[PDB]
Design a protein around this ligand. Structure first.
Ligand SMILES: *C/C=C(C)/C=C/C=C(C)/C=C/C1=C(C)CCCC1(C)C
Ligand SMILES: *C/C=C(C)/C=C/C=C(C)/C=C/C1=C(C)CCCC1(C)C
Ligand SMILES: *C/C=C(C)/C=C/C=C(C)/C=C/C1=C(C)CCCC1(C)C
Lengths: 229, 229, 229
């Protein structure tokens, strides 16, 4: 194809697909209902990302949004991916540390606003307002990172050290990889246009694989997922 | 801006935003998992309404729908608000009186049809059919009001009198404020066009703040939310 | 109306509506919370299908999708129906055999991809790619049929014989009726265009009523829904 960013969309599609199959093959056999949950959730993440990467690759997940007096290529399928994948990732973390339903409700609701305010920001036709929507989404992200640090973390330690330690690593990964997303949006095609879409697509591809597949490897190789007791 | 209804969209945006912050500040500290749930649910309601009011205010949540041979301004973002907020409000009520999963399923499903049939009605291009969709949505609303009165109410009394009494007030508020919505739609911009959008926007703004913020004040100041036992 | 397929859309609308009322009237009185769940779920199925059939009948749920250098009539409202009804049908089956949350999560997620990949396939503008999306959706369907056969079936027998036997019948019905859907899509208006939309609409109408109403009659007349113990 003629879009310069095809190679990264193709790469991203292959790695999500490859990682979906691996978690599928590893998953079969497992009879533990606790482990059964983590495998379901964590395998669905790249299975979804795979379909959205494919839709971007084939060109379905792309509309042109006019702003700054020019048609801009906006991959809307990213947000449809994130709207479903980011909540499932948070659910993986909350089941580990055995969060109560209240905390889960807030995280998931806040996540919904983050991605939703992101999408509206991405399709807003007044340039200034795009940044208003980014700020609100970013404000929701910080709330989520606050809950991951101060809503549970002390209660995550008052339990199995395999759950506590495995949570500590996955939390640190989540914070570092998720924080990058707003910065890339801000300087990429959707915000200031400082970085061209080509390289922005590379950056999201690296972030998405690490945040989904990299994340899943750490979790599915740990012994926190099993109950044993 | 040049839209006459801006002042009410701006007002509504400020009050939802102001009410979101208040429930947030009041919320922090609370350690009771039952209370934790009611706070999560009831704070998310205006947080969502805030973003949709903002989108209306900035002009994103507005399309023109042609019917009666004229372009009509239709704020579609109301329905995206209600689709999420109205179920969470019903969930607040069902957790109080400890409804079973079956009853919750019906209420939420019925709510989905109500708002969905509402949206389709709002974007239908044949004037007569709009009223067909209104009737079906209104038929779903009555079903919901029947369940609130006769599916639980006797079982809501066979429990803590703080839960029973606090439910009685919130139920009466819900019935009176929710019943108005179909009437306003019917006579406003979306139906008969007897009341102009300007004043219709005022009416929904007053209804929405009372049904969301007013509602939340009553609930969050009560001692039904806490378990204690 | 001038659309040849109106008679089947009208028929389908009447039978869904008629079946919704019947399950409603039969439903009232029932006080058993287990039975309460199955009635909620199984009554919502045709209540939803009714509204989507109506939207198709009135002409709201229809867009023209250009491919093969011609505008093609595509009833998008089928997918909005299935996106909600097919998960609720699977939930009826999983509550019978008392599946764990993990298995339910996978089935529902897989179902989401099936219908989602179906919709994208239905609105893809490159003819070849439509079949790529069909293959992925069909691959998700087979996964679901595998879980219905080999993820539970042995555990469905290790319990009440009324639950085991009633599950056996409903499973066999599900497999036979669901497998037809991809074949009809493939040869109908959305795929190869071997069968005209007129007769395709007939075929989906017969499948939908049997898969929803026929299905519901078998389930709601059984004694598996009640707990008794
Ligand atoms: C699987 C992909 C993941 C984990 C994606 C995460 C994406 C975010 C955390 C995005 C955040 C954004 C903001 C907070 C600012 C507005 C723009 C967004 C949506 C990129
Ligand atoms: C937070 C806002 C609330 C509580 C909104 C409630 C809205 C309704 C109960 C709307 C009902 C409608 C009908 C039953 C008739 C069709 C038009 C609607 C959607 C306004
Ligand atoms: C109430 C209606 C029901 C049970 C509909 C079921 C529909 C399917 C199982 C559709 C399956 C499809 C594929 C697996 C291939 C792609 C096209 C679809 C969506 C028709």
């Amino acid at each position: 194809t003629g879009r310069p960013e095809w190679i990264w969309l193709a790469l991203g599609t292959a790695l999500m697909g490859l990682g979906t199959l691996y978690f599928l093959v590893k998953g079969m056999g497992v009879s533990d209902p606790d482990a059964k949950k983590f495998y379901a959730i964590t395998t669905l993440v790249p299975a979804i990302a795979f379909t959205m990467y494919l839709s971007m690759l084939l060109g379905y997940g792309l509309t042109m949004v006019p702003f700054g007096g020019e048609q801009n290529p906006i991959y809307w399928a990213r947000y449809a991916d994130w709207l479903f994948t980011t909540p499932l990732l948070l659910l993986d973390l909350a089941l580990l540390v055995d969060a109560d339903q209240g905390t889960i409700l807030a995280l998931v609701g806040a996540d919904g606003i983050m991605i939703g305010t992101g999408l509206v920001g991405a399709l807003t036709k007044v340039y200034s307002y795009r940044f208003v929507w980014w700020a609100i989404s970013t404000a929701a992200m910080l709330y989520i990172l606050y809950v991951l640090f101060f809503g549970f973390t002390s209660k995550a330690e008052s339990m199995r050290p395999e759950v506590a330690s495995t949570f500590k690593v996955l939390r640190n990964v989540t914070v570092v990889l998720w924080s990058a997303y707003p910065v890339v949006w801000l300087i990429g095609s959707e915000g200031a246009g400082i970085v061209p879409l080509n390289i922005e697509t590379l950056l999201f591809m690296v972030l998405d694989v690490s945040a989904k597949v990299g994340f899943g490897l750490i979790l599915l190789r740990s012994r926190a997922i099993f109950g044993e007791a």
